[PDB]
């Protein structure tokens, strides 16, 4: 009784330990799997802000008029 | 002590030896001589170790628990409902081991006390260790040592599903 007063846990504090971190790693594991999804469907139609290889900025396309009246 | 209903003793037989012819009886002596020379000393020393022990007082509690409530109402993953289901039933499987470590030893008991007639009072034990026994081999055994609670409840649908397979067609 005295081992286990002075030096042990209870099962109440290490039962709730590993309730507590079956939560937050429960947590890791569901965003991870949500996120590897999310990468291939962004991928594959592109409707995201991640995979957007720069094209052409059009503020030097400068409408005005020209010199040959047909462009 | 220890309740006389879950670890039963039929009651005493004990003759009285009507002595023929007058030797007399050396172990009758004997056992006098061992009263005087170790039964009343260790009486006295454990006397004075229980005065000793009842001068302060100490308790140890039995530790108890809770229902949680299933395994057949936890969810596709909601690994918060499982954990408290494979705890209870891992509980369980530990009490139940010791159900079957108390029939066992009762069937001990039966072998070594009717003596060189075994099967006069030991039908009735024999009976529920085969029983008790048989439902251990039919509800934990073939599993294996990765046991968790699914398969049980896995080897539970497929029994149940396989006897519905045979009660239609005996139907």
């Known amino acids: 009784r005295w081992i286990a007063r002075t030096f042990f846990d209870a099962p109440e504090k290490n039962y709730e330990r590993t309730m507590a971190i079956l939560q937050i790693e429960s947590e890791k594991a569901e965003l991870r ?4 999804e ?3 469907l962004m991928r ?4 995201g802000p991640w995979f957007q290889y720069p094209t052409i900025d059009k503020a030097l396309i400068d409408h005005s008029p020209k010199a040959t009246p047909d462009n | 002590s220890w309740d006389k209903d879950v670890y039963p003793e039929p009651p005493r037989r004990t003759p009285a030896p009507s002595p023929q012819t007058s030797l007399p009886n050396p172990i009758t ?3 006098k001589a061992f009263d ?13 170790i229980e005065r000793q022990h009842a001068k302060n007082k100490y308790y140890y509690y039995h530790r108890e628990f809770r229902r949680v409530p299933d395994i057949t109402e936890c969810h596709e993953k909601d690994v918060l409902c499982m954990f408290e289901a494979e705890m209870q039933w891992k509980r369980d499987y530990k009490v139940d081991q010791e159900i079957v470590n108390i029939i066992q030893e ?7 006390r009717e003596g060189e ?6 039908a009735k034990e024999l009976q529920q260790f085969t029983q008790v026994v048989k439902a251990y081999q039919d509800r934990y055994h073939d599993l294996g040592a990765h046991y968790s609670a699914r398969k049980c409840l896995a080897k539970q649908k497929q029994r149940m599903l396989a006897e519905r397979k045979a ?4 139907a």
Do not use: I
Request: proline share 2%.
């Open chain 2, 29 to 31: 002596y004997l056992t």
């Open chain 1, 44 to 47: 594959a139609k592109g409707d």
């Open chain 1, 33 to 36: 799997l949500k996120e590897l």
């Open chain 2, 117 to 122: 007639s075994h099967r006069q009072n030991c």
């Open chain 2, 167 to 170: 009660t239609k067609e005996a």
């Open chain 2, 36 to 48: 005087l020379l170790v039964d009343r000393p260790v009486t006295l020393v454990r006397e004075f």
């Open chain 2, 106 to 112: 009762r069937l001990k008991a039966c072998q070594q």
């Open chain 1, 38 to 40: 999310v990468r291939r």
